[PDB]
Amino acid sequence: LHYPVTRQGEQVDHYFGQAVADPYRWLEDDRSPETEAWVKAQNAVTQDYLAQIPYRAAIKEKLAASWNYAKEGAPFREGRYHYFFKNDGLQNQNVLWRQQEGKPAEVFLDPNTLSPDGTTALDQLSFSRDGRILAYSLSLAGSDWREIHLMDVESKQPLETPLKDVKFSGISWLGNEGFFYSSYDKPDARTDQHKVYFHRLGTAQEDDRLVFGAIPAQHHRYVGATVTEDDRFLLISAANSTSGNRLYVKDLSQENAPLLTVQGDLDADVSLVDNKGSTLYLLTNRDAPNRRLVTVDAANPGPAHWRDLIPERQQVLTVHSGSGYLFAEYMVDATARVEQFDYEGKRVREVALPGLGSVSGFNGKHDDPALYFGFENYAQPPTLYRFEPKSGAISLYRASAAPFKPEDYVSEQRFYQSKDGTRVPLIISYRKGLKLDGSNPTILYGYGGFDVSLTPSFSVSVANWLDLGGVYAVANLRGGGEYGQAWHLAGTQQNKQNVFDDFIAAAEYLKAEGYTRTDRLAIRGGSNGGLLVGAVMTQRPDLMRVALPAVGVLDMLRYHTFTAGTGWAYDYGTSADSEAMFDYLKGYSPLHNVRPGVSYPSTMVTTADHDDRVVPAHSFKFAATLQADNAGPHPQLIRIETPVAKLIEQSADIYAFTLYEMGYRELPR
Structure with missing residues (x-):
């Protein structure tokens, strides 16, 4: 791949006496001419890569025809x-x-x-x-x-x-x-x-x-x-x-x-x-x-x-x-x-x-x-x-x-054990007739935070994934609200690592149970869920073949200084609370845990070009860092959105990219 050049600056931040380099600090300003040019260059490279996928048009066609009903x-x-x-x-x-x-x-x-x-x-x-x-x-x-x-x-x-x-x-x-x-x-x-x-x-x-x-x-x-x-x-x-x-x-x-x-x-x-x-x-x-x-x-x-x-x-x-x-x-x-x-x-x-x-x-x-x-x-x-x-x-x-025969699909709820022995719910859905032979293209999704409960809901996009032979697994990680205040708090501040361990255990379980395998597994999440993907892929890049972090909070040392960042503080804590909170955050912050020479899974970072909920700064700096540090052959791309038509396009690109990175030259069979 031919990634656009991403300039590295000399900004250096200090927390409790510890210095931390932030070479892509300039990308935090999503409205500067330099950042807007970088966004355009990155999208050109992402689109050229996606344009090489044989079945992208077919996937989009199916999504488009089944989207409205x-x-x-x-x-x-x-x-x-x-x-x-x-x-x-x-x-x-x-x-x-x-x-x-x-x-x-x-x-x-x-x-x-x-x-x-x-x-x-x-x-x-x-x-x-x-x-x-x-x-x-x-x-x-x-x-x-x-x-x-x-x-x-x-x-x-x-x-x-x-x-x-x-x-x-x-x-x-x-x-x-x-x-x-x-x-x-x-x-x-x-x-x-x-x-x-x-x-x-x-x-x-x-x-x-x-x-x-x-x-x-x-x-x-x-x-x-x-x-x-x-x-x-x-x-x-x-x-x-x-x-x-x-x-x-x-x-x-x-x-x-x-x-x-x-x-x-x-x-x-x-x-x-x-x-x-x-x-x-x-x-x-x-x-x-x-x-x-x-x-x-x-x-x-x-x-x-x-x-x-x-x-x-x-x-x-x-x-x-x-x-x-x-x-x-x-x-x-x-x-x-x-x-x-x-x-x-x-x-x-x-x-x-x-x-x-x-x-x-x-x-x-x-x-x-x-x-x-x-x-x-x-x-x-x-x-x-x-x-x-x-x-x-x-x-x-x-x-x-909806153009889907309910009898053709099945969903089951499993419960797996996390690192510390905690029992975690996992709902797995797919087309009836799937074999537990470990070859199924799978997307594991999670959030894990803010007392949010992931309850089942029908989605045309997910149904299309199932029709392609995909498995959709959703984990009810700690940090969410599935089992009251204790479930939530056990995934906050200096207990955040519990959420990531729960998700890591979910991926291991799906493989151990025969649903999928490393090169057929993709992980996905948005916002606090983008953080989840970013943390897990930097801690265990060997665990999955594809990583899809959407609108993620990825710079954990500076998220609280950005637009609307204060609202995420109750769950996360900030790098200014104390040296212990600073050390814990730096310990898992996706941006600061990307390392030169590590081979990362194929990644497609997604974000809008301007966003006051989760500033693009997070995704921009993370993508720049992955492109600079990745040593392996897998692409580190960022798709920046600048309407159902757009939703359809985004789903098509993501599924096409995921299958292509899994080695499929034609649709799953």
Whole structure:
């Protein structure tokens, strides 16, 4: 290869008396003319290399033809119609369709047609209790401001002039009288005092009644209002940030009832699930990190009176309700489990999900005859199922339109042992009919940090890899959130090496189990995941054939001084914290661990040319260093992105490069 020249400067940094040379310091300025010229030169070399791959065009063609496909959401009843969202695969915004008694479905509301480039988007939507009036909020380009439109459902015409100055607001109806919404400014100078207002249908917005937030004792940056399904209770949440909220309740069945305090401090998150009679069902993390579902009477709702209905477990709880049942959703070993409970807290059954993956749904009204839920995983595209609450019977409602036969793919979950004996989850997916003969082209992916949990999700790009004979393995490394705070912290600061060891052990396991072998293995990750790849490839360049670090944090001694670098500090620590933190960071920092004379695997570093999340500086200096130091015959390339078309192109280049570096002269067979 003919890499562009990368100038080496004389910058030298000092940490606790230790000097560290930074020859590519100038590449940290991604907008300088010199750096922009280098970016152009590097892309020219990468593109010329990729242009030599025989099957790149074929791979791109398959990706392009399978990328867009129609999608459909679950149907929901409002009045005498059933509504459901749909997207033809090309539309930028989902379309709301409607279908009655015995007629064909019709388009009801198409947000795309609301503007030229369709930069007017549909945000919140809420039907009056009788389903005859629809209130919906619309946004602009970026603007957080909203307008709430009111439509007569039967005629599809505007009922009143739209409400203006709405922001960070829900829409919740009180019967068919009107609805509650939030705004920083009186109807008729701006402040950060969010208020709840009630708009009564048939009146002007200027006459909307203030419900909460105006007096000093109610001043909060964010307030929300929800009316229970039976129109009995108004619940007002009030908060200053995403952490913790106060909550108040008002009994609408009583005349001029006062607000009672459900939670008067910001020490925990608490939200309304539903009510049964005067009993409130609340989901909270108060004294319960993994959350619990409690009940309390609305007449004396304080925390001291909350009683557990569904106690906190070792797994984080999410609650849904519908058809007179409560559904407790848990993430068990990174995948979904759903339990059906009655409102008295008695477990009815564990829902028989279609396998291990991710779910959505189980939301319905009290009287819904059936509930719908979505399911997907690495091997199965989004599919809708119908659930009969009484019997627990499940039936396929809508198969995916994605051009992939689900029965042709399989996914299994394994558990392997890391260096220190820790058991780690590993989900492996591939086309049915694979042989554990160690020859399968495999991509091992991981993240490992910031309490992020890697849960299964369908991706057209990954499905294309599987169709090529590839294996896709995802490891739930420490540092993530798969098993609570301990799993996370065990992958932070001076414990970061645990994450890398976990990933290294994942690669060894896949080989030992017969899935793949060194020259058929590629490792991939993005951001904290780019760091993962960069660290593992510099510690064990012998472990894999291909390395794919995307938008990685790679200079661990200076990441905190760059744009947005401070946010990564809780997990990593900085070179300025102490000499011990400095020494630990320098011990694994990918940039500082690349060594002259080492033979590195084939590498394709990827990054955009300008990025305020993870500055390009990381990838630029890392690629320059690999090109300067690599002694072996494998190419060290960087692909700098300067749209589905672009996503398709990126996936094609990566898979083409990966197969080509594995020695394939034609597509796998």
